Amino acid sequence: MKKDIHPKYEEITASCSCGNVMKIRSTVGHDLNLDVCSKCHPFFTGKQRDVATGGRVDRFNKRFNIPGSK
Amino acid sequence: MIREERLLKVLRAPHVSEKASTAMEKSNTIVLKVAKDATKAEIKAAVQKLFEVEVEVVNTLVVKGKVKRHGQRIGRRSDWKKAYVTLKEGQNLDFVGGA
Amino acid sequence: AAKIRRDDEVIVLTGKDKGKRGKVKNVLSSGKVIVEGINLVKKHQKPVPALNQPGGIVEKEAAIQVSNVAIFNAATGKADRVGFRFEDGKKVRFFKSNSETI
Amino acid sequence: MKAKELREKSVEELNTELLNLLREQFNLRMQAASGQLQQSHLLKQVRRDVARVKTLLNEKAGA
Amino acid sequence: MKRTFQPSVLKRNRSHGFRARMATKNGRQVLARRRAKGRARLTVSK
RNA sequence: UACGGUGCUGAAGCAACAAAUGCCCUGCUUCCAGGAAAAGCCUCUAAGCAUCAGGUAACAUCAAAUCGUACCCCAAACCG
RNA sequence: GCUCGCCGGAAGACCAAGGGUUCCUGUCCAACGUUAAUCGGGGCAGGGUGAGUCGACCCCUAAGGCGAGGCCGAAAGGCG
RNA sequence: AGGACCGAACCGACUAAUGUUGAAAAAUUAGCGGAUGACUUGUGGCUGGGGGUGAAAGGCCAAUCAAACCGGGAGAUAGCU
RNA sequence: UAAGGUGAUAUGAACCGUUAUAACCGGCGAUUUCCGAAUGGGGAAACCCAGUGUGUUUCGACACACUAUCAUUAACUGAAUCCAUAGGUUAAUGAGGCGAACCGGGGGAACUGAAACAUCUAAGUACCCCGAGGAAAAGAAAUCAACCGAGAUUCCCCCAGUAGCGGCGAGCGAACGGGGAGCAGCCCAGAGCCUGAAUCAGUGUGUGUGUUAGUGGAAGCGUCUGGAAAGGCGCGCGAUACAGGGUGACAGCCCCGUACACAAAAAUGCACAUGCUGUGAGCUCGAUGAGUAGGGCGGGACACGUGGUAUCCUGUCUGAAUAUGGGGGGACCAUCCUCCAAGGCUAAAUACUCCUGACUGACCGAUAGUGAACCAGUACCGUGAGGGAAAGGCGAAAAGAAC
């Protein structure tokens, strides 16, 4: 839903500050938008920036298209 | 006139009550009974093409008739529904009488 | 369904009327096979008030089921089960195990 | 005629026989007016023939 | 105070309602164990 | 007379006097916590019609769209 | 008949909580009236409550249901 | 004018009196007010568990809830006759 | 087939009919009082009204026909934007609707045996949610080892309760080594020669023979006692038929079971023989889709529970080399071995008995057994959300107060 080239992640696991305590760690909550994409629009293009972290061997299709196509 | 219509299941016998006496004076206000699909629309078109006679006005009646027959408190209620119709002024029962 | 065809003579032998003889019976779905009505003395009912109250005391329904003597002829009441061969095209009427069919 | 005896027929009863066959229920079937020593309850013992058309017409229209 | 038992229709939509006893899964097992498997009836639909 | 009634017929038939719980008053007043929206009531055009179409009027008609209407209440078939 | 009572903000009226047709009479005693029992919606044989105008479809909504595409979403589900 | 002084059923809640072996987890008889609003009053959808509105209470909240009317954990722990 | 029947538990009464449709069994098909699961939109389950057509009418109107959200491909259409794209009007087609439970996704507790409870066990079970078929999950090796080697997987006794971790605590709990079960290999990334040659999804045909009607199916008398002698005797006869229980009892002897011979419309089991629509077979030559891995620090399930650290994971981020090797060798790396290039496909073994079909009962013979004998999840409590009963059973003939 945010990284969708690599589908989903909200796991529920913890931070052990005094034995196996249930202080949950893994719940991500941070969001980014906008990049100059494969035709003309600086388009809504969501990220964390993960997706674009991963962008260094694509030509604007081979990964990017996974949720684009079907 | 229309022969593919709901009339074929919608009548019952006439209802014979004392009002064929007391109420019928200068016209004929006679009692009828009709079945579960009787909205007024289907009772309107029936009498003129089924029984050979011609009415003005029809009235229609949700009678929720409680019955018991089982010995122990219970039974059935039916559709039951009564009607009234209007055999006009002077043609009364002049060949045959459905009582 | 019984393949023995209702014109026929039977007796009681599986009860105290031992010997009492009669033909055709009265036969319907689940009938108790009352021979010819071989009853003794057993009341009738008086619900009606008017001139016709049923004065009867015999021949009302008195039971001995299916058949205990395979149609009499002279003596002897077996075999019952035996089913024979062609006589009518669409059905078969039966007698007993030494006499073919009726 | 239990319907099955008339099957040769060029048309089915919805042609207007449907009403000639059913008028009795609303005009004669009341207290004793259809009879008192001879008739009683007609619609299944004999007259069951009329219901049978209501499959058959669906049957034939497709054949 | 105003104790208690009474009949009514309009109050069935959050608690006593047959389509909601099928809409909720929580009702749906009850409904089959009470009639479709439970050999029985309800019929009180009015 | 079926003793419920219905069958036949029939007087008299004017003004005063005094107050509503109600009518006029979405009148008209007085005080402010500040009394909620699509409509009927009444008309303005946009398009598009435009020797066409629409609406308003005398009078002629037909359609008048499945319920409910029974008992019962400032309260015994609710509930207690 | 004959002399008086209880509800006196009447168990007067029509009907909305659906429980539903168990009112009138023709006739009745368990399945009941902590007395008689003729009466009690008891309970039984009949039948019944006649609505184009009563009010709710409608065109209509303040609060509040749901709702395109969606910001999202562990599977759930949340807000519009 | 004023949450006036003193007025009806739409208000609660003082001690008794016939309320305790109940008409009754609550209401009573001759009595008696807050007199138009620090009122209560009703169809129903938003408060659905360790609750959630605060004239602010440990009382409520099914009538006896410091978590009950749940039965699925579970025929639990068991220093227990 | 063989004669009677009108599903009934007041049978009053009609009315079919023993000629071969009276019912009623069975192949297949056809049936609409409105809801409808229901679907134009609306929902307080039983809807109350939009849309547009159709055969035809005593020309009032009518019974009736059809539409939606998606997943996926055609056609037409179309933005704030030359273009792009998005979004509508249709054309087609199937699933969205429904199961107790299995199984894949993860979740998922509280206290409580530990005599203390903030590790764990508890517990991957309560449920709730989502999938899609009858079987699955699996599975074609960064698999396991010592240089002997083994072959998807693991299963099954072991070795073993061995190695192996800990509030050093109660629990959890392997693999190798041996015997076995097993016992076979391909296809793209694609061109060629070859070409209905191997399979199967369908859809019609014949048999080989199912499913069930129709076909069937055994023995004896007398007598003393006698409501039924169906006990007792007699043996006068009997046996791969002496279940079990019915017929008023205790019946080899009447049974109804068996043991055995004959046989169907018409779809259609499965095995084959075929036939019509569609698939891919044979043999060369080509072919090679890394954000993949590495780490340094977190969260991790792993025989190893924080610790020095162990993968194949997972997440913010960073970021190579094509098998002239290194990813890893259950500490770390030798000596050297094994998988193998990160795409997809596999015969066997496992479970679910929905319900109904065959056989056994130191199992339930109403203090019970699937909540279940019922027709009892039905009524006697429920603001209710529904907890579900006290409860086996006249008995020739309802022979059920003639008189």
Phi-psi region of C25 (alpha: psi -120 to 50; beta: other; left: phi over 0): left
Specified resolution (Å) = 9.0
* Bases of strand I lying below 7 A from some protein CB: 1-6, 10, 13-17, 20-21, 23, 29-33, 37, 44-46, 55-58, 60-63, 71-72, 81, 83-85, 98-101, 107-108, 118-120, 128-130, 215-221, 227-230, 247-248, 251, 254-256, 290-291, 298-300, 306, 314-320, 371-372, 375-379, 382-387, 396-403
Count of beta carbons in the 10 Å neighbourhood of residue B12: 19
Contact B87, B30 (CB under 8 A): yes
Q: Which residues of A are annotated as a binding site for Zn(2+)?
A: 16
Which residues lie below 8 Å from residue A6, measured CB to CB, with a gap of 6+? A54
B45 touches strand G (CB under 7 A): no
Is the CB of D22 less than 8 angstroms away from the CB of B8?
A: yes
SS3 sequence of C33-101: CCCCCCCCCCCCCCCCCCCCCCCCCCCCCCCCCCCCCCCCCCCCCCCCCCCCCCCCCCCCCCCCCCCCC
Provide the Cα torsion C84, C87, C90, C94; round to 10°: -40
> Which range marks the domain in which residue D25 is found?
2-61
- Rounded CA-CA distance E34/E38 in Å is 5
- Rounded CA-CA distance C21/C37 in Å is 10
User: Angle CA(B33)–CA(B40)–CA(D27) in degrees, nearest 5?
Assistant: 35
Strands, E, within chain E: which ranges?
Answer: none
Cis check for the bond before C79: say yes or no (omega within 30 of 0): yes
User: Angle CA(C49)–CA(C50)–CA(C55) in degrees, nearest 5?
Assistant: 80
Residue B60 φ then ψ, to 5°:
-130, 145
Q: Which two tokens stand for residue D52?
A: 């049978």
Contact C37, C62 (CB under 8 A): yes
Q: Nearest by CB to B12, which of D19, D26, D33?
A: D26
Q: What is the length of chain A?
A: 70
Indicate the DSSP class of residue D48: G
Q: Which nucleotide is nearest to C46 (CA to C1')?
A: I402
- Rounded CA-CA distance D53/B3 in Å is 16
Provide the 3-class DSSP secondary structure of residue E27: helix
Indicate the DSSP class of residue D38: S
Widest pairwise Cα distance in chain A: 54
Mark out chain D residues that contact chain B at CB-CB < 8 A: 14, 16, 18-19, 22-23, 25-27, 29-31, 33
Query: Which residues are bridge partners to C11 per DSSP?
Result: C21
The shortest C-alpha distance from D17 to chain B (Å) reads 11
SS3 sequence of chain B: CCCCCCHHHHEEEECCCHHHCCCCCCCCEEEEEECCCCCHHHHHCCHHHHCCCCCCCCEEECCCCCCCCCCCCCCCCCCCCEEEEECCCCCCCCCCCCC
With touching defined as 3 or more inter-chain CB pairs under 8 Å, the answer for chains D and B is: yes
- Rounded CA-CA distance B44/B61 in Å is 14
* Cβ-based burial of B38 (10 A; exposed 0-12, middle 13-18, buried ≥19): buried
The Å distance, CA of E15 to C1' of H54, is: 28
Contact E30, E18 (CB under 8 A): no
- Rounded CA-CA distance A12/A7 in Å is 17
DSSP H or E segment with residue D17: helix D17-20
Q: Nearest by CB to D26, which of B3, B16, B50?
A: B50
Contact C35, C26 (CB under 8 A): no
Q: Which long-range contacts (CB under 8 A, 24 or more apart) does B92-99 make?
A: B92/B24, B92/B28, B98/B13, B98/B14, B98/D27, B98/D30, B98/D33, B99/B14, B99/B16, B99/B20, B99/D30
Which residues lie below 8 Å from residue C76, measured CB to CB, with a gap of 6+? C69, C70
- Residue E42 carries which side chain, given as an amino acid letter? L
Provide the 3-class DSSP secondary structure of residue D62: helix
- Rounded CA-CA distance A23/A13 in Å is 8
Contact B84, B32 (CB under 8 A): yes
Q: Which two tokens stand for residue B96?
A: 């045959």
The shortest C-alpha distance from D16 to chain B (Å) reads 8
Query: Which residues are bridge partners to A24 per DSSP?
Result: A14
- Rounded CA-CA distance B25/B2 in Å is 33
DSSP string for chain A: --STTS-------B--BTBS---B-------B--EE-SSS-EE---BSSHHHHT-TT-SSSTTTTHHHH-
Q: Which two tokens stand for residue D27?
A: 């005009």
Contact C57, C41 (CB under 8 A): yes
Residue C37 φ then ψ, to 5°:
110, 35
Residue B59 φ then ψ, to 5°:
-110, 145
- Quick one: which of B75, B4, B2, B82 has its CA closest to B38? B82
Q: Which two tokens stand for residue D25?
A: 């229920």
Q: Which two tokens stand for residue B52?
A: 């050979």
CA distances from C96 to B2, C2, C72, C93, D47 (A): 66, 13, 9, 11, 43
Is the CB of B13 less than 8 angstroms away from the CB of D30?
A: yes
Q: Which of B11, B15, B52, B96 to mutate to test the interface with D (most CBs of D within 10 A)?
A: B11
- The number of folded domains in chain D is 1
- Rounded CA-CA distance E17/E22 in Å is 9
Q: How was this structure determined?
A: cryo-EM
Which residues lie below 8 Å from residue E9, measured CB to CB, with a gap of 6+? none
- Rounded CA-CA distance A15/B52 in Å is 92
Count of beta carbons in the 10 Å neighbourhood of residue C35: 21
Q: For chain E, give every domain's residue range.
A: 1-46
User: Angle CA(B14)–CA(B16)–CA(B21) in degrees, nearest 5?
Assistant: 130
- Quick one: which of C79, C57, C67 has its CA closest to C23? C67
Show residues of chain D in contact with B34, CB under 8 Å.
Answer: none
CA distances from A44 to A29, A33, B69, E16 (A): 18, 6, 75, 47
Nearest CA in chain B to D23: B50
User: Angle CA(B38)–CA(B44)–CA(B48) in degrees, nearest 5?
Assistant: 125
Decide the pairing of beta strands B29-34 and B82-86: antiparallel
CA distances from A59 to A38, A62, A63, A69, B63 (A): 9, 7, 9, 15, 80
Q: Which two tokens stand for residue E13?
A: 């939509």
Mark out chain B residues that contact chain D at CB-CB < 8 A: 3-4, 8, 11-14, 16, 49-51, 98-99
- Residue D15 carries which side chain, given as an amino acid letter? N
Which fold is adopted by the domain E1-46?
Helix Hairpins (1.10.287)
